[model samples]
Target chain A: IMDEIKVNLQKEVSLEEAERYAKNIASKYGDGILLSVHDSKTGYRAPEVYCCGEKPWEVYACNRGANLKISVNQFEFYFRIEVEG
Target chain B: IMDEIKVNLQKEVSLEEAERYAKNIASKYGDGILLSVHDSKTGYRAPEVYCCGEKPWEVYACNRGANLKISVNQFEFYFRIEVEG
Candidate 1:
């Protein structure tokens, strides 16, 4: 919706609802937030989204490879949200 | 009309890499980001909501205990990629 500033995720909530939930989750977790995203077809997966101090939030697209040029706009990933529990 | 605007938080980082992450914690985490509103027995609690700012992101409800009064829509707190954090 606004260049790559928009991040599409697995959660299917509207932007307003998402923000409501995000705030709740962040306030409780603070520095403890953890997340994951995956693309089965490409065998592309990223497991580092938290705790690493440096691995903060990011935008990514999953598809094609071995010389596939892309933008952060391309899609597909099983977005996952999990805390130490 | 709940003034609730959206400000969903971010999770996934990029395959290319993140150009930013809580860039200036002090630049991000202070004024100490806070807010709360509530009324209970009517069973209410001070729910704090955040956004790009206060006035544009509040959702108020319930009638007054001290009297049926309120709208305090002009208050709330939250922040994101602004010279903010």
Candidate 2:
């Protein structure tokens, strides 16, 4: 299982540049998946919903501040815990 | 107010992927903001600190991991040097 990494930009960034860099990493590391990249002012979220198998997932809000914030969550137990449990 | 990118693995991925993605654009453009990515098993710390508006703020920590970690901080200025001058 690969961890999903998401980035939200507070300031203006070149989307193409971002994608290129992300693609390289995704191909090399294999530990991270490019779940999505969003523009807050534009109101665009990533296509992936951060779902664990069939269940909704949660993440930790590690850092937050004016104009920007970042968070992360885990789904490692998705296979271990029965869907019903 | 220009550069900030944060990533945390919510799945298992390759480290090469992570670095490649980050460096490609960060170095190419002016937003060369590189913070830190931690490996839970290795306990490595990034050498930068995130600060803003004359004080410490926060971030959303958009991704989490079982074996990998990533984070960002912006110090956009060490120049408004009002420190004991």
Candidate 3:
């Protein structure tokens, strides 16, 4: 089974905004396509893209207090989103 | 390094009717069981579902026209699934 972990975003950002940033990065590096988006605030989660790759190669993002949780295989990475004042 | 995102789906409603809809939604929520689906419009974007607790909370969905790029740690988000006929 996959392990569970959490990563906190450096800043607070909306879901849509986050998606854009991620897409740009994926386009630069990585194979396959975007997959889905899930929100803990409203409990609204949905699949948005399909990817092509191997097992334990999928990645996902989670939201926490002013941070986002990223998961790969079974490991979690924390990072904050940079917001402008 | 868990930063990648994407979401696409609206009133179009075609995955399932009512019961099927509810089932699909629940099953697809955030489980972590990636499977393949069929779509003539955009080749074939596998539709799988799986989710447990926090950390890596895996969920994915992909399409072309209304692309989906969602990442919490990475930052990216957009909306465009509303369709009416």
Candidate 4:
């Protein structure tokens, strides 16, 4: 199932700062593979941003349910997890 | 101040349908000017999607406050309203 989560930083930050924060999250959850960085101000996005991992698309299309969204200071992170009993 | 609001349709639809929905909203509030459409699936975004109105960027940059975001059925619409009291 696809789940949605949001994080609000509350203070507007630069794109570079946001990118670093995204890299940190991707490193922890996405195996250091930054799939995409979308800038609303510029209105430009990429399929894969950093390209630091092997088979990034596989992970993005499979593990993470959707792309991360940052607006001003808020962030929307979508991920998928399994349950083993 | 920039404010955010989100609408969840709860079922995945095609990009075309999403664009229509977006256009409807833009018509009602944005003077029928659809500034941009960002698709995570395709990982591409444009400054303006449909060339519907005149001086669209001026409206978008000054009024909406942010871009509209759609994820599989969820819609995020940003608008600006003036208050006088």
Best by TM-score: 4
lDDT of each: 0.27, 0.33, 0.32, 0.43
DockQ of all models, two decimals each: 0.02, 0.28, 0.02, 0.03
Native RMSD of candidate 3 (Å): 18.6
* Candidate 4 residue-wise lDDT, B15-48, digit = tens: 6776665554334224443444545555444565
Better of 3 and 4 by TM-score: 4
- Interface RMSD in Å per candidate, to 1 decimal? 11.7, 3.6, 13.4, 12.1
Model 1 docking tier (incorrect/acceptable/medium/high)? incorrect
The first chain of model 3 has a TM-score of: 0.39
lDDT of 2 by residue, B1-85 (tens): 3224454444444555655555542443333333344433444323332442222221212221111122422111111111223
**Model 2 ranges off by over 4 Å:** A6-11, A30-37, A45-85, B1-7, B10-85
DockQ score for candidate 2: 0.28
Q: Please report the interface RMSD of model 2 to 1 decimal.
A: 3.6
lDDT of each residue in B1-85, candidate 3, tens digit only: 2222322222233433322322222232133222223333433233322343222222332322222223221222221233333
Residue A48 of model 2 has an lDDT of 44
DockQ of 4: 0.03
> What would the per-residue lDDT of candidate 4 be over residues A1-85, giving only the tens digit for each residue?
3322232344676777766654443333234434444454654445644454653533554455443332334333332322233
Best by lDDT: 4
**Poorest 10 consecutive residues of model 3 chain A by lDDT?**
A49-58
Q: What tens digits encode model 1's per-residue C-alpha lDDT throughout A27-79?
A: 43233222333332343345544453431223332221111111111222222
Backbone N/Cα/C clashes per model: 8, 41, 43, 0
* DockQ winner between candidates 1 and 3: 1
